[PDB]
Amino acid sequence: APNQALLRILKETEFKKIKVLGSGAFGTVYKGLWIPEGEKVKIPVAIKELREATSPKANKEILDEAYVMASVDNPHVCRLLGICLTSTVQLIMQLMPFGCLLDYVREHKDNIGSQYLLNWCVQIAKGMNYLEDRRLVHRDLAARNVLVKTPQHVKITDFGRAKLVPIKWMALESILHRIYTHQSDVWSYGVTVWELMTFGSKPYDGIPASEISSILEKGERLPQPPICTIDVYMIMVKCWMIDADSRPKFRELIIEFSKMARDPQRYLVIQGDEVDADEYL
Amino acid sequence: EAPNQALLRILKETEFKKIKVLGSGAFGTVYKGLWIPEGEKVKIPVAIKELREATSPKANKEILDEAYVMASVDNPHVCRLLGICLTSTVQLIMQLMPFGCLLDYVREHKDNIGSQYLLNWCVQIAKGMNYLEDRRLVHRDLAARNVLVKTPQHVKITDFGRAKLLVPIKWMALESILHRIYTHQSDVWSYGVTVWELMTFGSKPYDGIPASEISSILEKGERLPQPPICTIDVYMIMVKCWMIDADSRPKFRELIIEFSKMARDPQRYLVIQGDERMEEDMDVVDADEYL
Numbered sequence: 415a416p417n418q419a420l421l422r423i424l425k426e427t428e429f430k431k432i433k434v435l436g437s438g439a440f441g442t443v444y445k446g447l448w449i450p451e452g453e454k455v456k457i458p459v460a461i462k463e464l465r466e467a468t469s470p471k472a473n474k475e476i477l478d479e480a481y482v483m484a485s486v487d488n489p490h491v492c493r494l495l496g497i498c499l500t501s502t503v504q505l506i507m508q509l510m511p512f513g514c515l516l517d518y519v520r521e522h523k524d525n526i527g528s529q530y531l532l533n534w535c536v537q538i539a540k541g542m543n544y545l546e547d548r549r550l551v552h553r554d555l556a557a558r559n560v561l562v563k564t565p566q567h568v569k570i571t572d573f574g575r576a577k578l579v580p581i582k583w584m585a586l587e588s589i590l591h592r593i594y595t596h597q598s599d600v601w602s603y604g605v606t607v608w609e610l611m612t613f614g615s616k617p618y619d620g621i622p623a624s625e626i627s628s629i630l631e632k633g634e635r636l637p638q639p640p641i642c643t644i645d646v647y648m649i650m651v652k653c654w655m656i657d658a659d660s661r662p663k664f665r666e667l668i669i670e671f672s673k674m675a676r677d678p679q680r681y682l683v684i685q686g687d688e689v690d691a692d693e694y695l
Numbered sequence: 696e697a698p699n700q701a702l703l704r705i706l707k708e709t710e711f712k713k714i715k716v717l718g719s720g721a722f723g724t725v726y727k728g729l730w731i732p733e734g735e736k737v738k739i740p741v742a743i744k745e746l747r748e749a750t751s752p753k754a755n756k757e758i759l760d761e762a763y764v765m766a767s768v769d770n771p772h773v774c775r776l777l778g779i780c781l782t783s784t785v786q787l788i789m790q791l792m793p794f795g796c797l798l799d800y801v802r803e804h805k806d807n808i809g810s811q812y813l814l815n816w817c818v819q820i821a822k823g824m825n826y827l828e829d830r831r832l833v834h835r836d837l838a839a840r841n842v843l844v845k846t847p848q849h850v851k852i853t854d855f856g857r858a859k860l861l862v863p864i865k866w867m868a869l870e871s872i873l874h875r876i877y878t879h880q881s882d883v884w885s886y887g888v889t890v891w892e893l894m895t896f897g898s899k900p901y902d903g904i905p906a907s908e909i910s911s912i913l914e915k916g917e918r919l920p921q922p923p924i925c926t927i928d929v930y931m932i933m934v935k936c937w938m939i940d941a942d943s944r945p946k947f948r949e950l951i952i953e954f955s956k957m958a959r960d961p962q963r964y965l966v967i968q969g970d971e972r973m974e975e976d977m978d979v980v981d982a983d984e985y986l
């Protein structure tokens with residue numbers, strides 16, 4: 415029907431960049447402070463200035479992404495706050511205090527519980543299902559791209575493609591033919607999960623990126639994280655089937671983990687197991 | 696309701712090669728090959744199964760459930776799955792058993808097999824099948840060419856293609872032939888023929904009989920005949936397993952016990968009268984040395 419989600423346009427002077435968050439091949443990120451004009455309030459944010467090259471073809475393109483971060487309302491996907499109109503469009507968004515899901519697990523890894531890990535998997539599967547339900551391919555899904563609002567709430571948030579290269583996290587169809595379907599995302603999901611279960615291991619460490627396409631024919635994949643039971647590692651493997659049709663659908667993944675979420679210690683073995691923008695409104 | 700921490704190693708194909716073909720089921724085939732972990736100067740003897748050639752997805756979601764199972768059981772009497780491979784058409788790795796199919800071993804060293812050796816295998820198998828019936832599972836396919844020999848002192852079941860929970864007709868119960876109904880008691884019928892197989896050192900059950908008159912033969916009340924080296928005490932247990940009434944058949948728990956009695960005194964139940972027992976480099980450690 416009508417799709418009335420506001421796009422709010424902010425002027426740059428209202429907010430400044432503090433420290434750099436990460437770098438992508440085209441464009442970068444900052445964590446900064448938004449200070450509405452004369453409102454005595456400093457809102458924590460995240461800003462993305464475009465890849466500096468700015469030619470026009472890319473601008474009609476960067477904007478379609480802003481359209482999207484702006485048009486989805488779901489508990490599991492970040493929601494875009496503002497955008498800026500520099501010559502090279504910038505995008506604004508609420509900052510998530512606990513950082514990338516990838517960082518959070520490295521810093522409080524001695525403390526993460528089995529109950530906590532499954533809840534994140536079930537949540538992400540929902541966030542990805544919402545988009546697959548909305549017919550949309552993320553194409554870039556992986557640990558450094560899910561966020562932590564509170565250890566109890568996570569949200570997907572990079573859309574660099576959001577088409578409606580990260581090879582280690584891409585399906586075989588992708589590497590060889592640049593074919594992304596909803597099921598090509600599932601392959602990424604499978605590696606994203608392996609990421610949590612190692613609290614931050616680099617998938618395929620030290621394997622030159624070019625030998626990767628050949629490794630997968632040869633039939634090798636990522637190994638079994640320690641704290642994983644075989645019931646969990648099996649779902650990771652199924653997502654890596656060379657046949658895109660053999661992979662689980664994001665709808666079914668929500669369900670499978672919801673089962674394990676009921677009984678976390680039966681599937682995960684851990685030693686010693688046991689101002690806000692959002693506020694703004 | 697205890698967690699399942701069974702490992703599943705994923706291997707890349709280049710790490711191992713197929714040497715000679717082993718056996719065949721029309722969809723799928725075995726192989727005996729050599730697994731060579733990357734640059735670890737070791738050649739491990741293996742067995743590989745490249746599943747049946749088509750990869751209709753429907754079948755892939757199915758082939759993997761089998762791998763889940765060979766992987767999830769720890770018992771001295773069931774082979775245990777080592778690795779799997781991710782070709783498009785899934786493949787499976789497993790520790791090779793040096794003495795081959797239990798069906799082959801008995802043909803090549805038949806003039807030397809002793810009464811004590813034969814009963815020990817029966818009691819062992821009964822345990823291997825009980826372990827599965829105890830974990831709610833039907834092989835559906837059990838027969839001589841599917842038990843293996845680790846050492847003349849240790850045997851293990853190993854083929855699951857069917858692996859169902861809840862066609863080799865000569866080895867199937869009557870419920871199976873007419874209605875495809877496998878229960879744990881319908882494996883018992885197979886067991887009965889598997890044993891008859893040992894007691895003939897490899898005779899083809901129902902030889903020359905066209906497979907289609909087999910369902911009719913069984914209602915006529917005929918069955919497999921008495922292997923010579925069998926006393927009637929042993930052949931009776933074979934017949935009881937062939938009762939048309941699935942409820943009349945012996946349970947795998949009870950079979951373990953019955954043979955354990957005969958295993959105490961092998962010459963009182965088996966008559967052999969030869970009775971008494973007993974260039975290719977080695978780079979090569981069998982399944983155990985490598986974790």
Ligand SMILES: *CCC(=O)Nc1ccc2ncnc(Nc3cccc(Br)c3)c2c1
Nearest residue numbers: 435460462505507508509510513514517
């Ligand atoms: C791990 C470093 C990091 O990305 N941390 C972080 C914290 C909170 C966030 N809140 C909102 N956005 C992002 N990242 C980000 C990436 C791309 C585009 C946008 Br506007 C925001 C984070 C990231």
Ligand SMILES: *CCC(=O)Nc1ccc2ncnc(Nc3cccc(Br)c3)c2c1
Nearest residue numbers: 725742744787789790791792795796799
């Ligand atoms: C009698 C020929 C034969 O099957 N020999 C043989 C020796 C050792 C084995 N070790 C492991 N597996 C098998 N067979 C087999 C069949 C199906 C699937 C798998 Br991965 C292995 C044998 C067989």
